[PDB]
């Protein structure tokens with residue numbers, strides 16, 4: 001069994017918009033925008049939906065930048081995380097109950113305040129490289145093992161319900 005998720009990085013020439021989880025799981029960490037793809041929606045519509053809900057932003061285009069798989073100890077569920085980035089946004093960023101957007105200069109990324117896997121694949125995203133990655137987690141804060149690879153084109157999964 002896997003669970004289908006999206007993550008969207010709003011990435012501009014000198015800056016990246018992250019959001020601070022205000023409540024819930026992972027509260028107090030900065031991350032990209034996204035969440036679970038629900039039944040009855042496509043991955044890309046779920047990505048657009050979560051970004052609109054969490055930041056109030058609309059996007060003209062999303063670029064498929066990567067795939068990450070998360071495995072946890074104790075959970076048979078795997079997470080299939082489809083990563084996107086976008087340069088072209090409209091609206092002004094405003095917080096939801098769940099998330100508060102804030103801009104960071106690209107050399108000021110707060111990796112100590114983000115999830116540990118971000119230290120690995122965020123550099124590739126910031127180099128405009130496409131990637132596949134896998135991270136085996138223990139609890140919240142501990143990567144047990146991982147693999148990461150750059151790729152030329154990204155990985156179509158052909159989800160036929162999404």
Ligand SMILES: [Zn+2]
Nearest residue numbers: 038039161162
């Ligand atoms: Zn489904």
Ligand SMILES: [Zn+2]
Nearest residue numbers: 063085086087
């Ligand atoms: Zn992009």
Ligand SMILES: [Zn+2]
Nearest residue numbers: 080082157159
């Ligand atoms: Zn997938």
